[PDB]
Amino acid sequence: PKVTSELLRQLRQAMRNSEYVTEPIQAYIIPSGDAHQSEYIAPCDCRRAFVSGFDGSAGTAIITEEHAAMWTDGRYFLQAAKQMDSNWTLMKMGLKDTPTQEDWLVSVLPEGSRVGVDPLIIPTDYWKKMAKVLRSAGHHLIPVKENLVDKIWTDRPERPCKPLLTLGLDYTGISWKDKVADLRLKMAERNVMWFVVTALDEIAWLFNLRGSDVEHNPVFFSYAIIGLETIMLFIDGDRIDAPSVKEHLLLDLGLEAEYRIQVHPYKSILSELKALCADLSPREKVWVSDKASYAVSETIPKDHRCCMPYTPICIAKAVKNSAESEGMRRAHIKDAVALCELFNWLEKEVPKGGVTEISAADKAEEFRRQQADFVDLSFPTISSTGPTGAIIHYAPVPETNRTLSLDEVYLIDSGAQYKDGTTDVTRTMHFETPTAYEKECFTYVLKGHIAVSAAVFPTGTKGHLLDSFARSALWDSGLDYLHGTGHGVGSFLNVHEGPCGISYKTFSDEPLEAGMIVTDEPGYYEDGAFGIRIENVVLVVPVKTKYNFNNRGSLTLEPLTLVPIQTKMIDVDSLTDKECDWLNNYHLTCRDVIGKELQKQGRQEALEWLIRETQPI
Amino acid sequence: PKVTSELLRQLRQAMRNSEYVTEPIQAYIIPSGDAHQSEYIAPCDCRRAFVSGFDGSAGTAIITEEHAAMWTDGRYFLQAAKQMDSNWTLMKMGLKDTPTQEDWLVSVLPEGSRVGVDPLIIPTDYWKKMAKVLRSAGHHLIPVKENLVDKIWTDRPERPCKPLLTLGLDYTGISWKDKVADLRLKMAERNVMWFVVTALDEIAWLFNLRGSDVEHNPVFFSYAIIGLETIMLFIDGDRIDAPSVKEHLLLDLGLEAEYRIQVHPYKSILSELKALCADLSPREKVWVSDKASYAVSETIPKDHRCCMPYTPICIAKAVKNSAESEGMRRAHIKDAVALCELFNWLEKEVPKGGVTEISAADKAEEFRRQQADFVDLSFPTISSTGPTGAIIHYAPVPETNRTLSLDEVYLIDSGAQYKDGTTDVTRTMHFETPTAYEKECFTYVLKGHIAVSAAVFPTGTKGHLLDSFARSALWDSGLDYLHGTGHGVGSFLNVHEGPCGISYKTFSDEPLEAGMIVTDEPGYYEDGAFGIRIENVVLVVPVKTKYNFNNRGSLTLEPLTLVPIQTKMIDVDSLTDKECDWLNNYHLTCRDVIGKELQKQGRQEALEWLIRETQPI
Ligand SMILES: [Ca+2]
Ligand SMILES: [Ca+2]
Ligand SMILES: [Mn+2]
Ligand SMILES: [Mn+2]
Ligand SMILES: [Mn+2]
Ligand SMILES: [Mn+2]
Ligand code: NA
Ligand code: NA
């Protein structure tokens, strides 16, 4: 484990330093998250890993005068125990006797204690829950503005500050000026004077900009404040002065004043927000996400604070316009070309005995990089053979890197960001003869996949109402999968994007409408044996029906992912005619669209593979 | 219309009377609801009808110095306009230009106005929404303790105060002492000192008592406060002194003190709650429903107020024990006997031309009353032929009472309270030859009904996740129904009971578990032509499956309703084998269970009908 005895000594001393706290605090909370509720935390924000040695993706540390405790989930019980030294106490989340953070605190704190946390990195949700319980026991939760880990972290990496990319109308369908105008119409109809934007993907979409400050998600560290007559963009770096960016943002015009973007330092967000709020008149509202940091939300006086589950940006960007959806189609056509090359290569090379989980993942990236306007992977590839495939959240380590073979089911989940769009696809396959049980499970999963993709439903049906269609065949045999059926997908933006989706986990998802894009990804995982998942990105599209009730219209799903589904894995005699017709048609569509592209790109061998793999059942 | 000019004059004067208000109020709100959020409002509480002349089931009146406005929904636009005189302004809810109550108020009120409402008859939800908007415009929402309509309502009927009925262990499965003990264990594990019970069905279930103060729902006006060491029942009437009731409630013992029920006047609820709250120490909590009246909730100081979506009584009573579920089976067997007699009678009598929607409803009640321990109808019968059937909320009027015929689809939805249990059943039928479209729609509805009833799903699946199964066949052809698929059902208690159910309207319903009872009732309504609904009460039951994932087990539904589904209405060639087998089996189960009962009861003619109507397809 990392030796953290001296780090803890220094942190405990910082907890008492008058420069940071008016009075000493008896406990300090170090969460995983960053200031924007990011999905992938930048190295500079991996404070919990720094103080503990535990560097998994999830975990909350709490340091007291006497104790250092770490809460993490099942993925990490073993990792945390190994990585942390004897200073640390492991709190195994999910287990029956594991105390909550707040109840643990009450049990270890002396009378009338102060508990500190950096307010920029927790939401109000968490603040309220913690503050309540602590207050009951005579304690106080204190926002400590200076991050205490940063104070002791001598060799803390700089915040990533990478180039910006501009996206033109061909890609976005609508200008940033028009997006801001649309947003202001929504603000006016609600007496909102100011809208504070804290989610990095929302800022990227609003200004038609992209970046690479965060892994996978093509976003950049920033905030924005939108007024009715002004715009304030909080961003660091000379990147903002690149000629393409100046031109795109109209920064060297003598333009109309309401579209003049004021560029402020990234650190200035709270002080500029405080100054605007100081000047509010009684009925004036400030819109903020209910997901925003406590520091940002608390800056807005309660009387003026208009919290919302989903900002109007989240709602607008959920529906892809024709430029965006055409980009998604293009991105998927390129991605399928790359996967035809990959799967052909796998069929040739796996029997030779040298293909490993990592080398196959490497090869997937290699083929993707050949395609025009490839940017990066949209998430880390999952490449799992045999028992590894049952581990839903499995990520490579060289010492448990398995060799692909003719005797094990292989699952590959992978995806890319292209300038045109964003992909996410899982296929499960076998290189010789699968067992009947492997085929049985695959076929239940496929039945669910088709039940969702072929579903016809009224406009405005919430996606969660499609989730059980994916599960019916599994459920009938006593099987299930412990994940959601689908999520929204961004347009050259986060592969995991709300507010639409298909899950049993929420009823508050947005009604499905034409232009939304989601995944359809049922699976089945047999611990110690194999895993199966069949995942496509699908576009919500209008569809004509026999009858027309209550007006409104109906919708169905159209796959953008065009990659064969391996027929040897299917118990064909168990399919309905509808399912058989669906797969045959899907396969001919793959052959049409991807085959044309393969021929255009001169990729004969991959085209031959695609034709073999798209034969009817 | 009713002449309400003088009533309004008197109400306007009451709004300024120092005996009722410290200062005059400029507006007064008169809602539909009563103090317990009852489903069926007692005549004495029909205040909105009294002041306006409009006596539909839904509507909110607001009286100002200058205006009298009525908000109601689509069912009642015509009724309200006809029943109210020229003093009244109709506010058509749902329509685009119809203002909300609170925005209408701001538009008609003078500066710095007070708006009054009786706090006993609105929830905090409504109070908060109204108070906020009014406060913004410089106005104040005032709780006015003395109901102002009652002050002017000279011939107001007395509150119903009907006999109480006791239910023994054979019916309830568990004593009230044991229910109170269970509730107290839940209170202790939450540091709750007091639990205020405001829902009439919860009080009935807790004390194993029933009544008839409210139409249909077998409940009695009361409140209860449960402490850890005391019980307080707020109830009026010498009914509490009936020997059976004294014995049941252990009121003439020298019993252990924690089960001594203190009987207080019904009106004393607020003053006794205020006195208990005066004595709370800092960390002591009082449990109240978030549905409770503002008057009750506000009595509890905010620091001590522990609001909950579902009380622990609501959660416990949702799961029927074996005594309760066996009662439900018995009640359904009796109800089916009555319906076999009814449907046989219909087949004989409709061709003679004298059967009307009302006479058929009357006959349904007549046959039910023959059965042992019939108590009353569980809701008003819906009896609709032809176009009436498309009107989801249709209730008889003698001048639109249609004659049943050989040329129209007939829908009958009916149900009873028996001492043993509660029923709710819809059947749709035809007395000669239906059209292909009528059969097409019926078959889509039946497919949905079977998809739900035959569903197999993991324990703890939320019922809302079954809703789309009922709709798939309709949806595929562009049809739908604008109501939920099912609701929970009480045990000799409200036919409409949560917190479980099957609806697109909520994601916050409770996970399904063995012992819950719900309806399965898809339909289809063709405006100006016909309606179809096929409704059974079903019990959630365990079921063995081929495989066993994640432990937990699986569940399915077992119909308690045993009434034939008419095969002439079905496009049989369109059914799957699963659906055909389901119906054949269901019909033989009807024949077994109900046939045995008919034979035992000596009902030969009805038995002959049942055998004809349960032949295989
Ligand atoms: Ca084999
Ligand atoms: Ca006919
Ligand atoms: Mn994926
Ligand atoms: Mn995915
Ligand atoms: Mn009914
Ligand atoms: Mn019903
Ligand atoms: Na999930
Ligand atoms: Na409904």
XYZ file of C-alpha atoms in Angstrom, chain B residues 103-459:
357
model
C -52.467 33.596 -11.456
C -56.179 34.395 -11.777
C -56.085 35.623 -8.175
C -53.101 37.940 -8.795
C -54.933 39.390 -11.826
C -58.175 40.197 -9.944
C -56.931 41.070 -6.441
C -56.315 44.610 -5.140
C -52.915 45.467 -3.606
C -51.884 43.597 -0.450
C -54.856 41.209 -0.356
C -55.561 38.285 1.969
C -56.858 35.024 0.497
C -58.546 32.570 2.885
C -59.143 28.828 2.857
C -60.200 26.210 5.425
C -56.857 24.548 6.400
C -58.498 21.201 7.247
C -59.410 20.466 3.637
C -56.241 21.220 1.640
C -52.823 19.478 1.688
C -49.481 21.335 2.248
C -48.669 20.675 -1.404
C -51.521 22.946 -2.483
C -50.908 25.444 0.333
C -47.220 25.901 -0.693
C -47.873 26.378 -4.416
C -50.640 28.923 -3.743
C -48.853 30.742 -0.884
C -45.658 31.207 -2.958
C -47.281 32.895 -5.973
C -49.518 35.077 -3.782
C -46.580 36.182 -1.603
C -44.653 37.208 -4.763
C -47.508 39.562 -5.757
C -47.710 41.098 -2.278
C -50.616 38.951 -1.063
C -51.038 36.513 1.845
C -52.679 33.096 2.099
C -54.545 32.884 5.401
C -55.805 29.729 7.121
C -59.344 30.513 8.241
C -60.288 28.016 10.963
C -64.075 28.539 10.848
C -65.390 27.202 7.548
C -67.248 30.107 5.963
C -69.632 28.056 3.823
C -70.811 26.201 6.920
C -71.592 29.563 8.529
C -74.142 30.374 5.804
C -75.399 26.839 5.163
C -78.541 26.805 7.273
C -79.757 23.316 6.340
C -76.345 21.625 6.166
C -76.756 17.856 6.650
C -75.191 16.233 9.724
C -71.968 14.303 9.247
C -72.777 10.639 8.637
C -72.207 8.656 11.845
C -73.151 5.088 10.997
C -72.508 1.809 12.906
C -69.079 0.253 13.241
C -68.382 -3.345 12.262
C -65.703 -5.534 13.873
C -63.577 -8.024 11.896
C -62.222 -11.113 13.656
C -58.977 -12.997 13.094
C -60.533 -15.335 10.541
C -60.931 -12.241 8.315
C -57.882 -10.155 9.236
C -55.152 -12.715 9.994
C -53.609 -10.512 12.714
C -54.977 -8.611 15.720
C -55.020 -4.854 16.120
C -52.707 -5.246 19.144
C -50.182 -6.971 16.877
C -50.571 -4.318 14.182
C -49.956 -1.571 16.747
C -46.928 -3.463 18.111
C -45.509 -3.794 14.567
C -46.095 -0.101 13.935
C -44.321 0.834 17.186
C -41.250 -1.226 16.239
C -41.095 0.892 13.074
C -41.543 4.127 15.061
C -38.759 3.241 17.513
C -36.268 2.455 14.722
C -36.815 6.043 13.487
C -36.948 7.975 16.797
C -40.586 8.777 16.118
C -42.630 9.361 19.278
C -46.026 9.873 17.638
C -47.736 8.826 14.450
C -50.816 10.762 13.306
C -53.220 8.702 11.191
C -55.495 10.753 8.950
C -56.503 8.326 6.168
C -59.786 6.590 7.033
C -58.800 3.275 5.432
C -55.579 3.178 7.453
C -57.535 3.636 10.710
C -59.995 0.905 9.712
C -57.187 -1.518 8.860
C -55.182 -0.716 12.004
C -58.055 -1.411 14.400
C -59.718 -4.166 12.354
C -62.907 -2.108 12.206
C -65.109 -1.095 9.273
C -67.901 1.443 8.806
C -70.154 3.052 6.193
C -69.814 6.804 6.778
C -68.393 7.304 3.236
C -70.108 5.893 0.106
C -68.527 2.669 -1.263
C -65.389 2.695 0.889
C -66.298 0.882 4.166
C -64.715 3.436 6.496
C -65.722 5.779 9.336
C -64.849 9.401 10.147
C -62.033 9.344 12.701
C -58.393 10.159 13.367
C -55.848 8.242 15.425
C -52.635 9.155 17.167
C -50.333 6.264 17.981
C -47.674 6.758 20.677
C -45.136 4.261 21.976
C -47.127 3.831 25.204
C -50.575 5.208 24.388
C -53.256 5.151 21.667
C -55.756 7.940 20.967
C -58.797 7.347 18.757
C -60.779 10.474 17.751
C -64.305 9.368 16.929
C -67.867 10.515 17.646
C -70.978 8.517 18.418
C -72.396 5.931 20.820
C -71.454 3.417 18.102
C -68.131 3.172 19.965
C -70.095 1.795 22.968
C -71.727 -1.102 21.110
C -70.846 -4.266 23.067
C -69.127 -5.977 20.111
C -66.968 -2.872 19.582
C -66.092 -2.503 23.269
C -65.083 -6.164 23.363
C -63.058 -5.989 20.155
C -61.172 -2.854 21.245
C -60.656 -4.271 24.760
C -62.335 -1.173 26.243
C -63.794 -3.047 29.259
C -60.629 -4.725 30.520
C -58.096 -3.680 33.157
C -55.520 -4.367 30.437
C -51.821 -3.520 30.003
C -51.548 0.274 29.659
C -49.856 0.481 26.226
C -52.923 -1.031 24.565
C -55.441 1.139 26.378
C -57.265 3.072 23.656
C -58.273 6.572 24.770
C -61.440 7.658 22.976
C -61.601 11.385 22.277
C -64.148 13.553 20.391
C -63.595 13.710 16.623
C -63.212 17.509 16.840
C -60.448 17.277 19.439
C -57.737 16.130 16.985
C -55.971 19.489 16.599
C -56.086 20.481 20.251
C -54.770 17.086 21.458
C -52.068 17.091 18.766
C -51.085 20.647 19.739
C -50.798 19.574 23.402
C -48.564 16.574 22.576
C -46.371 18.730 20.356
C -45.993 21.363 23.120
C -44.240 18.627 25.166
C -41.772 17.311 22.547
C -38.082 17.310 23.356
C -35.607 18.468 20.642
C -34.971 15.195 18.732
C -38.483 13.744 19.000
C -40.301 13.177 15.719
C -43.983 13.070 14.751
C -44.869 10.967 11.646
C -47.560 12.414 9.389
C -48.568 11.652 5.807
C -47.394 14.217 3.278
C -51.048 13.951 2.100
C -52.462 15.118 5.494
C -54.316 18.429 5.736
C -52.360 21.646 6.209
C -54.200 22.100 9.542
C -52.914 18.765 10.863
C -49.375 19.039 9.437
C -48.876 22.688 10.528
C -49.890 21.776 14.081
C -46.624 19.808 14.251
C -43.697 22.204 14.642
C -41.483 22.077 11.549
C -38.449 20.951 13.598
C -40.339 17.819 14.683
C -42.387 17.117 11.570
C -41.498 13.887 9.796
C -43.542 13.795 6.576
C -43.783 10.588 4.546
C -45.160 9.678 1.092
C -46.514 6.353 2.435
C -47.186 5.626 6.064
C -46.067 2.263 7.470
C -49.749 1.363 7.600
C -50.116 1.913 3.851
C -47.079 -0.348 3.290
C -48.249 -3.105 5.649
C -51.825 -3.239 4.379
C -50.655 -3.497 0.755
C -49.533 -7.055 1.402
C -52.485 -9.343 2.101
C -51.848 -12.177 4.552
C -53.339 -15.640 3.977
C -56.576 -14.862 5.904
C -57.060 -11.711 3.820
C -56.231 -13.298 0.475
C -58.439 -16.331 1.171
C -61.259 -13.838 1.946
C -60.602 -12.141 -1.383
C -60.900 -15.538 -3.117
C -64.246 -16.210 -1.357
C -65.601 -12.767 -2.194
C -64.648 -13.301 -5.851
C -66.312 -16.749 -5.959
C -69.593 -15.245 -4.689
C -69.281 -12.305 -7.089
C -68.757 -14.666 -10.036
C -71.870 -16.635 -9.086
C -73.856 -13.397 -9.191
C -72.364 -12.476 -12.592
C -73.103 -15.918 -14.066
C -76.745 -15.316 -13.087
C -76.590 -11.793 -14.525
C -75.016 -12.692 -17.860
C -77.411 -15.621 -18.336
C -80.318 -13.251 -17.604
C -78.889 -10.750 -20.105
C -78.679 -13.410 -22.819
C -82.332 -14.323 -22.231
C -83.736 -10.841 -21.838
C -81.808 -8.493 -24.121
C -83.369 -10.011 -27.322
C -86.847 -9.197 -25.925
C -85.972 -5.457 -26.162
C -86.693 -4.316 -22.615
C -83.231 -4.263 -21.042
C -81.705 -0.841 -20.463
C -78.324 0.308 -19.174
C -79.914 1.066 -15.804
C -82.069 -2.056 -15.578
C -78.975 -4.219 -16.262
C -77.034 -2.355 -13.543
C -80.020 -2.837 -11.205
C -80.062 -6.559 -11.981
C -76.333 -6.898 -11.274
C -76.942 -5.483 -7.771
C -79.977 -7.727 -7.317
C -77.944 -10.867 -7.968
C -75.053 -9.694 -5.798
C -77.410 -9.051 -2.848
C -78.350 -12.756 -2.901
C -74.825 -13.726 -1.902
C -73.783 -14.314 1.713
C -72.299 -11.298 3.497
C -72.821 -8.855 0.677
C -72.309 -5.369 2.162
C -72.631 -2.822 -0.656
C -71.318 -1.888 -4.100
C -67.602 -1.036 -4.158
C -68.191 1.762 -6.721
C -71.109 2.842 -8.978
C -71.766 0.338 -11.773
C -70.782 1.389 -15.270
C -73.335 -0.130 -17.659
C -72.868 1.166 -21.205
C -74.077 0.040 -24.594
C -72.842 1.367 -27.946
C -71.475 4.932 -27.952
C -71.851 5.315 -24.142
C -69.181 2.656 -23.740
C -66.531 4.970 -25.205
C -67.157 7.492 -22.404
C -64.705 6.274 -19.774
C -66.368 8.134 -16.862
C -70.043 7.542 -17.738
C -72.727 7.482 -15.064
C -76.478 6.948 -15.722
C -79.070 9.668 -16.237
C -82.619 8.401 -17.011
C -82.965 10.553 -20.160
C -79.820 9.125 -21.794
C -80.564 5.569 -20.547
C -79.974 3.407 -23.642
C -81.657 0.105 -24.506
C -79.340 -2.908 -24.897
C -79.606 -4.582 -28.277
C -78.313 -7.202 -30.649
C -76.428 -4.486 -32.598
C -74.136 -2.821 -30.034
C -71.206 -3.809 -27.823
C -72.110 -3.787 -24.114
C -69.630 -2.963 -21.321
C -70.348 -3.646 -17.645
C -67.927 -2.670 -14.858
C -69.148 -3.518 -11.403
C -67.969 -4.679 -7.988
C -68.976 -5.290 -4.410
C -67.818 -5.153 -0.823
C -68.435 -8.403 1.050
C -67.399 -9.004 4.659
C -64.795 -11.343 3.062
C -63.336 -8.997 0.473
C -63.636 -6.514 -2.359
C -64.272 -6.963 -6.079
C -63.917 -5.022 -9.300
C -64.590 -6.609 -12.698
C -65.276 -5.396 -16.246
C -66.563 -7.550 -19.069
C -67.428 -6.453 -22.600
C -69.809 -8.539 -24.679
C -72.104 -8.690 -27.690
C -75.509 -10.345 -28.017
C -75.244 -11.361 -31.650
C -72.520 -10.573 -34.242
C -69.878 -7.865 -33.594
C -68.053 -6.113 -36.415
C -64.528 -7.098 -37.411
C -63.205 -3.810 -36.019
C -64.989 -4.407 -32.685
C -63.375 -7.877 -32.525
C -59.999 -6.432 -33.660
C -59.970 -3.938 -30.771
C -61.255 -6.487 -28.243
C -58.477 -8.882 -29.249
C -55.754 -6.225 -28.869
C -57.151 -5.520 -25.399
C -57.277 -9.230 -24.518
C -53.684 -9.729 -25.743
C -52.628 -6.944 -23.359
C -54.655 -8.374 -20.508
C -52.997 -11.771 -20.926
C -49.520 -10.219 -21.378
C -49.879 -8.709 -17.920
C -51.597 -11.637 -16.177
C -49.175 -14.240 -17.594
C -46.075 -12.086 -16.946
C -43.267 -13.623 -14.891
C -40.966 -11.168 -13.170
C -38.444 -10.902 -10.356
C -39.630 -10.206 -6.820
